[PDB]
Amino acid sequence: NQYDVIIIGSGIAGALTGAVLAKSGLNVLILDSAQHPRFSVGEAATPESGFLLRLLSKRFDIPEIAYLSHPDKIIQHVGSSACGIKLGFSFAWHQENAPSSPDHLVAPPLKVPEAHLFRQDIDYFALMIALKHGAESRQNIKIESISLNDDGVEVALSNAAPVKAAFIIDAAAQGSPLSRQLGLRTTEGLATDTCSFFTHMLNVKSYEDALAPLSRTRSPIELFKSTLHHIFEEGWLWVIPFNNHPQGTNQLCSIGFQFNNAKYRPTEAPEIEFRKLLKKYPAIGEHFKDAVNAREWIYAPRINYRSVQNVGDRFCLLPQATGFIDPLFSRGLITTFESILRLAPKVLDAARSNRWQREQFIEVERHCLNAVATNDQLVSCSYEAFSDFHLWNVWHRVWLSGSNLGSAFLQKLLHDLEHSGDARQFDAALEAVRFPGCLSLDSPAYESLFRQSCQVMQQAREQARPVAETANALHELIKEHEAELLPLGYSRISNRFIL
Ligand SMILES: Cc1cc2nc3c(=O)[nH]c(=O)nc-3n(C[C@H](O)[C@H](O)[C@H](O)COP(=O)(O)OP(=O)(O)OC[C@H]3O[C@@H](n4cnc5c(N)ncnc54)[C@H](O)[C@@H]3O)c2cc1C
Ligand SMILES: [Br-]
Ligand SMILES: [Cl-]
């Protein structure tokens, strides 16, 4: 075998996977059909993704991976166009045939700033980390076939010699050739059925200049410096600026709108569908008066999918190749970076002992399948919560309380790894969690709340219950479970900005 591991796809997942494996002593090859620079979606960084990036950096001793978790460090080391700032999430609610109220807004601010990842520069920077640590990159290739055997993997390429390796990691992310040929992908048993239009734009106005200033909204953060979600019955639109950091030089703002296909199926071209949306919601249109498009619209008719299995003797699909739900709540990078953190140590043990069996990577599958399953419950219920503001306001505390518990648990693992310096203890502690894939990670009290809350929302969809009844039901559940959650005051509805 020419190599130890072959990685398909040279975006952030594949490049970071290649970096840690090259650093750990494996002879790594990274294949890609596209080439850098190239555009990619997956821009909103979360607190969990920040800790998971810092864990990867510490666990495998690569300081440059930790630079991607903080916006100032991106600006300094990657480049000044490589990210915007993020001081939180903002969810502005809208209704067709009604003027938009500035009071219909929830915006839980963050403690430490996060990045809005300009992925063309971030993913190329991630590949450069892999290349500097000894990984080989081959771009612009054409995969003829991928053969899996009991003694190894063999990849055949157009106009080149075939390459061979012990393992193959699919990081190709929804153009996954290994997912196609194995017959793992399916949309069966998915609550979320959604499409997506997305692009990058110039001259997009800020929320403050377009809709309502800080004095009016009373928000502790500028929504300009946040992942802004414009939500409404049939779907949502995102405003993710890269031009919101003071030292930043990027002019672009990522814009993407999604529909629930059960409520609205788009019929016409992306630009026509966009203007029809701004007609429906004039408030959202205030962003795009003098705005112009910086690239083509991409239309994905169904972004949702999952897999029945995602590992074998000689392979392992990374989360994006495995399954995906929706941009909402930015769960893709969280699942991605955690799956690498779980996979990499097991691949090292396989490569070091020459044992390549499915049972060794079973905990990578269990996490990944549960994560997509959880996020499907989270998103499908969240899409149903868009129908009314008060319903959403109550509902988002279910997500937020889970995300805070999950962030604190990953922070605890980082704190123990930094002080103790014990890699095996960290790997075991991460594997020891009671609810792998879920939002809280380890808390049974939260998962009780989460799974009961989702039953209420699915009952509300199936029987078409009133929004006041559903909102009350969730409020009693929060009040029941509040004591076991963090002491933040999740139950008081009048507080729309949970510090
Ligand atoms: C519309 C949309 C919005 C999203 N929004 C968010 C968000 O707000 N927050 C968030 O955290 N996540 C989001 N995600 C998920 C996000 O895309 C992933 O978390 C992340 O981008 C995955 O990185 P990656 O390197 O695996 O994939 P990518 O960055 O897409 O890289 C994959 C690479 O594989 C290559 N490739 C494809 N097919 C083949 C083949 N047959 N052979 C060889 N190479 C191939 C591609 O050319 C590409 O270079 C979103 C996804 C979509 C579709
Ligand atoms: Br997801
Ligand atoms: Cl996501």
Quote the ligand 2 centre to 188 CA distance (angstroms). Answer: 16
Angle between helices 12-23 and 47-59 (to 10 degrees): 20
Quote the ligand 2 centre to 27 CA distance (angstroms). Answer: 30
CA atoms of 156 and 322, how far apart (whole Å):
22
Which residues are registered as beta bridge partners of 254?
200, 240
CA atoms of 443 and 270, how far apart (whole Å):
42
Task: Pull the structure tokens for residue 491.
Answer: 């139950």
Residues 6+ apart with CB under 8 A from 35: 139, 140
CA atoms of 425 and 416, how far apart (whole Å):
9
User: After which residues does the chain have a break in its backbone, defined as C to next N over 2.5 Å?
Assistant: none
Ligand 1 atom with least separation from CA of 13: 25
On whether the CB atoms of residues 313 and 355 are closer than 8 A, the answer is no
Residue 341, helix vs strand vs coil: helix
Residues 6+ apart with CB under 8 A from 130: 10, 15, 16, 18, 19, 22, 28, 30, 137
Residue 76, helix vs strand vs coil: helix
Angle at 125 between CA 47 and CA 41, to 5 degrees: 60
CA atoms of 101 and 122, how far apart (whole Å):
36
Q: Find the radius of gyration of the CA atoms of the chain.
A: 22
Ligand 1 atom with least separation from CA of 31: 43
On whether the CB atoms of residues 107 and 221 are closer than 8 A, the answer is yes
Q: Cis omega before residue 63 (within 30°)? A: no
Ligand 1 atom with least separation from CA of 175: 38
CA atoms of 420 and 326, how far apart (whole Å):
37
Q: Which residues line ligand 1 (CB under 6 A)?
A: 8-14, 31-34, 38, 40-44, 123, 143, 171-173, 175, 177, 196, 198, 256, 303, 320, 327, 330, 332-333, 336
Q: How far is CA 463 from CA 260, 414, 455, 470, 472, in A?
A: 18, 44, 12, 11, 16
Which residues are registered as beta bridge partners of 164?
154
Question: What method was applied to determine this entry?
Answer: X-ray
Task: Supply the range of the domain harboring residue 333.
Answer: 1-499
Angle at 121 between CA 115 and CA 122, to 5 degrees: 50
Quote the ligand 2 centre to 49 CA distance (angstroms). Answer: 13
CA atoms of 410 and 50, how far apart (whole Å):
10
Ligand 1 probe mutation, 178, 295, 320, 334, most atoms within 8 A of CB: 320
Using CB atoms within 10 Å of the CB of residue 175, give its burial: 0 to 12 exposed, 13 to 18 middle, 19+ buried. Answer: middle
Ligand 1 atom with least separation from CA of 298: 1
Quote the ligand 3 centre to 461 CA distance (angstroms). Answer: 23
CB atoms under 10 Å from CB of 451, counted, come to 12
CA atoms of 405 and 485, how far apart (whole Å):
8
CB atoms under 10 Å from CB of 278, counted, come to 17
Residue ranges for the known binding site for Ca(2+) are 4
Q: State whether the Cα torsion 27-31-37-39 is positive or negative.
A: negative
Residue nearest ligand 1's atom 20 by CA: 42
Torsion angle in degrees (nearest 10) through CA of 91, 95, 100, 106: -20
Residues in the chain: 499
Total domain count, the chain:
1
Looking at the CA of 437, name the nearest ligand: 2
Quote the ligand 3 centre to 318 CA distance (angstroms). Answer: 14
